[PDB]
Each structure stands twice: as C-alpha cells, then as structure tokens.
Amino acid sequence: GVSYEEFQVLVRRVDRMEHSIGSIVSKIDAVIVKLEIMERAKLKRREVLGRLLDGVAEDERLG
Amino acid sequence: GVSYEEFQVLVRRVDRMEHSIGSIVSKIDAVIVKLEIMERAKLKRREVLGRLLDGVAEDERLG
Amino acid sequence: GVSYEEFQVLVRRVDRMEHSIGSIVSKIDAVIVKLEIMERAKLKRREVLGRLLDGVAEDERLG
C-alpha cells in the first residue's frame, strides 16, 4: 500500500539528484580538461626556458 | 500493485545515493579549491625566483 | 494508487544513476591519485635541479 503522494516524494528527490549528477559530471570533466591544458602549457614553458638556458651555456663558453 | 517493502527498498537505495552525492560534491569542491591554492602559490614562486634571477643578471654585468 | 510500471520506471532511472555515481567516484578518485603523483614528481624535480644549481654556484666561485 503505497500512495501516489508517497511515491511522488521519492520521484522529486530523484529528479533533484539527477540534476546534481549532471552538474557534478560537468564539473569533474572541466577539471580534467583544465588539468590537461595546464600540463600542455607546462611542457611548452619548460622547453622554451630550456632553450634560453642552452643560449646562456653557449654564450658563457664562446661569447 | 507495489508493496511498501518494495518501495522502501528503493527509498533506502536513494538515501545511500544521496549520501554518496554529498560526499562527491565535497570532494570535487575540495579539489577545485586546492588547485587554486596551488596555482596562486605557483605564480608567486615564479615571481620570487624571477626577482632573484634579475639580481644575478645585474650582478653579472655590474658587480 | 501506484502501478508497477510507474514504479519500475523510477527503479530504472535509479539504476542508471547508481551506475553514473560509480563512474564519477572512480573519476574523481583517479584525479586525486594523479594529482599526488604529479606533486611528488614535482618536489623531486625541484630538488634535482636545485642540486645542479648548487653545483653551478660552487664551480662559479672555485672552478
């Protein structure tokens, strides 16, 4: 013996949970895409600075 | 024809899921606040080291 | 008055949500373990480069 109102209460909770899960998935996904934008930016930065240091080494010895 | 016990089983599953969603939201949020504490700390670190390098350049040329 | 079919519809939604929550938990957890693998790798890298710089300082003054 379960009434519609009892049932509807559970449906509304599930509706809000489904909306929270949508938001959470979007948030975790954005974290993951941002962490890779950061990782890519980092490797490039270390290479660019690496090339400047190659230049300091060459000038120190031959300049 | 749905019995209370059938229904109650679904309510208990939803209760545990709601608790998992609370924990997940707290976890994702902590990740995001920590990543910004890290990002801020990083920019400061690069600036502080940048100022020491400015000092090496000045001393190398005028010391 | 709630029919099994009405109820079953909510059970299937809850089943898919439970599967999404499992996936989300695995994803957030992997983010957290990866961020620590990265943090550990970083401290080691700064120490190793720190030791090379100690070497440049010593050679500059005594070489």
Curated annotation (Swiss-Prot), chains A, B, C:
It is found in: Cell projection, Cilium membrane; Endoplasmic reticulum membrane; Cell membrane; Basolateral cell membrane. Residues 1-40 form a coiled coil. Changing residue 10 to A: Abolishes oligomerization and interaction with PKD1. It is linked to Polycystic kidney disease 2 with or without polycystic liver disease: An autosomal dominant disorder characterized by progressive formation and enlargement of cysts in both kidneys, typically leading to end-stage renal disease in adult life. Cysts also occurs in the liver and other organs. It represents approximately 15% of the cases of autosomal dominant polycystic kidney disease. PKD2 is clinically milder than PKD1 but it has a deleterious impact on overall life expectancy. Homotetramer. Component of the heterotetrameric polycystin channel complex with PKD1; the tetramer contains one PKD1 chain and three PKD2 chains. Isoform 1 interacts with PKD1 while isoform 3 does not. Interacts with PKD1L1; probably forms a Ca(2+) channel. Interacts with CD2AP. Interacts with HAX1. Interacts with NEK8. Part of a complex containing AKAP5, ADCY5, ADCY6 and PDE4C. Interacts (via C-terminus) with TRPV4 (via C-terminus). Belongs to the polycystin family. Forms a nonselective cation channel. Can function as a homotetrameric ion channel or can form heteromer with PKD1. Displays distinct function depending on its subcellular localization and regulation by its binding partners. In primary cilium functions as a cation channel, with a preference for monovalent cations over divalent cations that allows K(+), Na(+) and Ca(2+) influx, with low selectivity for Ca(2+). Involved in fluid-flow mechanosensation by the primary cilium in renal epithelium. In the endoplasmic reticulum, likely functions as a K(+) channel to facilitate Ca(2+) release. This is Polycystin-2. It comes from Homo sapiens.
